[PDB]
Write a protein that binds this ligand. Structure first.
Ligand SMILES: O=C(O)COc1c(Br)csc1C(=O)O
Length: 297
């Protein structure tokens, strides 16, 4: 029982210990391709790399490397692609990945600039009249519309494969108030955002895996995915007590290193899941409440 465990950890204030225990037990697989000299400029962080076994391969003979991992949650039956914020030279690769993997949604949990630094390249058009063309991957990206809320923006984009001229609508979910190595304002604002992504159908199994990223693609992104998977597990069995949050995080860490970067992000994951469980078990009204408490208007 997560709610009981939560109260127990909070009482003894031992979140740091619990979190470090997960780190100690976390899987360790090679990241040789990511460490190849030719890919040095394709990585934003020297200490954050995708494992070779779960890395996303670009469909090109030249260089198929991109700092992105496929987190395939067998039991939950849902997959996510976690990646770093695209660099000025990997935006073409980023969209190539979105196209090849047939993703319908992209979840961004960081701002382009945080604490005075550029944590992510401006990989999407900010104005309808100024579309983007990635010559290296022969793709065109156009902003179709955007719905701006107080702490998050949802954009509708049109991605076109210039080679075949095929077109696809990509939904962009941009959470703009989640601090690096931080946590959301409240479980309410986080769940409100998560359900926005869910209600878009971007997580449907008929689409490719949703792409999730922050700056490094493990802290904030890890928190997002853990919460979602836990709620999904719980939902499939309609049994909140059947989910072991720590166990699921460890499973996720088999696919990408360092998912969830601080003990508080872990603690926030519990909070989010516990609160989200209310909706899963039939309390439809809580959704309206989260929307109100989030102050998105
Ligand atoms: O997402 C997070 O909470 C932390 O991710 C980050 C990691 Br790993 C290294 S730097 C960095 C950042 O956001 O600058």
């Amino acid at each position: 029982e997560m709610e009981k465990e939560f109260e127990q950890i909070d009482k003894s204030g031992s979140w740091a210990a619990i979190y470090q225990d997960i780190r100690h037990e976390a899987s360790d697989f090679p990241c040789r391709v990511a460490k190849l000299p030719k890919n040095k400029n394709r990585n934003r962080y020297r200490d954050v790399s995708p494992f070779d076994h779960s890395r996303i391969k670009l469909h090109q003979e030249d260089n198929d490397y991109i700092n992105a991992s496929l987190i395939k949650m067998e039991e939950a039956q849902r997959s996510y692609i976690l990646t770093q914020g695209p660099l000025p030279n990997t935006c073409g690769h980023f969209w190539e990945m979105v196209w090849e993997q047939k993703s319908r949604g992209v979840v961004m949990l960081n701002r382009v600039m945080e604490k005075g630094s550029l944590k992510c390249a401006q990989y999407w058009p900010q104005k309808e009249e100024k579309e983007m063309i990635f010559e290296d991957t022969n793709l065109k990206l156009t902003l179709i519309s955007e719905d701006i809320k107080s702490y998050y923006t949802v954009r509708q984009l049109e991605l076109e494969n210039l080679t075949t001229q095929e077109t696809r609508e990509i939904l962009h979910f941009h959470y703009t108030t989640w601090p690096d190595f931080g946590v959301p304002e409240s479980p309410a604002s986080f769940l409100n955002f998560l359900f926005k992504v869910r209600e878009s159908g971007s997580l449907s199994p008929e689409h490719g895996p949703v792409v999730v990223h922050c700056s490094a693609g493990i802290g904030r992104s890890g928190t997002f995915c853990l919460a979602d998977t836990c709620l999904l597990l719980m939902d499939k069995r309609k049994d909140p007590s059947s989910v072991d949050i720590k166990k699921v995080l460890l499973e996720m860490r088999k696919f990408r290193m360092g998912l969830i970067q601080t003990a508080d992000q872990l603690r926030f994951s519990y909070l989010a899941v516990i609160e989200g469980a209310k909706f899963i078990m039939g309390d439809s009204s809580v959704q309206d409440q989260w929307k109100e408490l989030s102050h998105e208007d």
